Structure formats: structure tokens, C-alpha cells
Design a protein around this ligand. Sequence first.
Ligand code: NA
Length: 213
Amino acid sequence: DTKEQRILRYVQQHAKPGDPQSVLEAIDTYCTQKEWAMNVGDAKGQIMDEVIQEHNPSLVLELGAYCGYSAVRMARLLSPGARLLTMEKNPDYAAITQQMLNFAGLQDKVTILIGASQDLIPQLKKYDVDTLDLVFLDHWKDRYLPDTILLEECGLLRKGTVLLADNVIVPGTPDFLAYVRGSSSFECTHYSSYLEYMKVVDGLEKAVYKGPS
Ligand code: NA
């Protein structure tokens, strides 16, 4: 079994069905115990919650998924009529994410789009998306800049659209942080989670779009 299959199995065996908090705790406990991801609730979940709750988005796009932790984290916060679209190229990751949301009872809050972002971002209009309220960029940081460019080109960002990117601790290429910070179109905040010691464990960037030209 893959790691993502083993995470789902642990949830199925230990978490309370229909209880998103229980599912999140189970994923976090298991991954921390295996040393695959340390204390994600503390390192990024609390920041995700802060940003989403300050903005109350009606339409969230998640770019990237692995085991569904982030999707459950966000979907549990959405109001009636609000929804999450989760886009992921790897069908195995998308399948685990679907089953994780099902177990949490959050499946009606989410649509899972299985495909490459280059192919699917230009088709988000077919999902009745005019503009997005919040975009969560998950794990695969080298995709963040080209995905942001595609969102701009497809007219999916409005004045006030929030981008929140995970796993931006060290410089990479393409350099998403340099792009949003350097551009006058984005207002930016960086978050560094240290847990209880002095080394960064996770880093996130919030970039708020100022609107199209
Ligand atoms: Na900027």
C-alpha cells in the first residue's frame, strides 16, 4: 500500500465517521508518528483556518491534493452554498481525497477535478466559476507561479481574491514568492510556523490580488 492508502486506512480504523475534527486529528497523529509530516494542524491548519474565516469565501479552488487533509480542513469551514473545487492530476491522490471527504461527511461541499492544471484551469468557467474568492496552493510549489499566471489569463481573479500557498520555506524555481511580492498586483503576507523550537517547519504566503487591468 502507498502512504496515502495507509493514511486513509488509519482514518477508517480510528476516526469517528462524519466528524471532520476527528478525521483531521487522525491524519495528523498518524503522520506525526510516522514522521511523514509533523503536527500539520499546528504548522499550517491554524493559518488556513485564520485566513479562510477572515474572508468567508463562497468559492475556493484547491490546486493540488495528496491525502485530503487540506480539503477536509477547508471544507469543514464553508457555509451553505459555498463550495470547494479540488484540482489534482494524480488519480490515486484524488481517489484518497474523495474517500477522506466521504468519511468526514463533507462530500457535498467539494467537487474533485482530476487532470492537469494547464488543461483544467481554462475550463473552470464550465463549472460556473466566474471569479474565485480564495485559492489554496498545496504542496507542489513549483506549480504555484504557472498556475497563478493561468488564473490571471483566464480571468478567474477579482480584486480581493486571496491566494494562500503552503510549503514556501526555501526559494524555488519558478519563484512564486518573488513573483507575488515584486508585482504591484499582489499584497503579501508570509507566515512561518516554528512549532516549539527555532527552525521553520512550514511556511505559507498569502497574496491578495488587487484586480485586473
Ligand atoms: Na506585491
